[PDB]
Amino acid sequence: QNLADPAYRRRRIIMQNMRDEELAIAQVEEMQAVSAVLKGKYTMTGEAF
Amino acid sequence: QREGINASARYPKNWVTTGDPAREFTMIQSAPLMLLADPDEFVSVQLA
Amino acid sequence: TSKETFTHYQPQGNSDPAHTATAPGGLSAKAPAMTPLMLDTSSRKLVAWDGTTDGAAVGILAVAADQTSTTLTFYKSGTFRYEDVLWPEAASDETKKRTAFAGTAISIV
């Protein structure tokens, strides 16, 4: 009923992506603390790392 | 280095590649190093 | 009732650049766009990748074409994902299918 600019759609894609990286980073931020005060032992290991 | 901002919490960045592919990209970088001064302060009891 | 999941299409696998080129082709049937290909062993004419010989996949298509298409537009650099790319059933052992583009800027992710 009400379409919009693909260019503005591009902006919305940009901002949702922004929130996506923020959440993704914060998610490993909690994971580090989880390992830390859950075992006192931790392994920071992944592909290309 | 170009902004001398190596020391920070996070790092946003945006950029774009030229040529017949017109493609921008967004880039975030940080070095999470979360640590605890007193490791033995907490006791992890695995309940059963 | 109906579900039309609005999903995106990201054939590119990584931000590394993808390069294109053109060359005459000698297909035998319809070749869907972005499909692996080889070079003929007799006349060195562009042919479809069989999926049986290892390391002979050399190119991936760009636009829809058939055996009627004398020339083919194909990609020769970049990284593309596991999923979006189409393989014949002949290539059955997947770890074998990993190293089809060994030695080429075309890469698997």
Added chain:
Amino acid sequence: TSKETFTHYQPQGNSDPAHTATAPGGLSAKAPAMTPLMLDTSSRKLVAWDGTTDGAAVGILAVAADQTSTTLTFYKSGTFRYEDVLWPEAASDETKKRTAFAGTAISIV
């Protein structure tokens, strides 16, 4: 009097990047720049690509060279015109003449 044609220089075909690399060369005569080359069989030493050894075309020279030219500079990426690059006459069959660079990132556009 007499008119002469002043024309630009366009060896490239598209905006794709062109990369150079160096390796010692084992020519048999004077070899002008931008010439196809292969490796030998015994020591696989660098030589000009003959035009008959299929699949051996691996590089395109950058600077004209000779016997005294121990090393060679040669282009490793991009696409260049059909017309501009000078090839040996032993490459007498056109269909394999396009496809001489199979597996290489350097291409004919």
Added chain:
Amino acid sequence: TSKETFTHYQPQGNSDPAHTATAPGGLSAKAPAMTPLMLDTSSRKLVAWDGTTDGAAVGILAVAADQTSTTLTFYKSGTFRYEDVLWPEAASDETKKRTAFAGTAISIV
């Protein structure tokens, strides 16, 4: 005390882009980064390059790995300094060493 010669971190010899690719590894021993690679004879699974198999260099390792590492990342494009490369011991002749990457985008500068 003692000498303190320290060097910068730029193995690159040219401004050419460096590209990486990931593929399942089949090593039998620990292999640090900047280690060359072969495919096996039958499974053509990833191993380190021996230095005797001609033209078998398929990639140069990006990060350190071992036989426990199922998959590995390796550089696939650009030119890099000879001095920084960890050549295998069986690769005893520099004349055949420089062109171990014949037909590939990996180059020695």
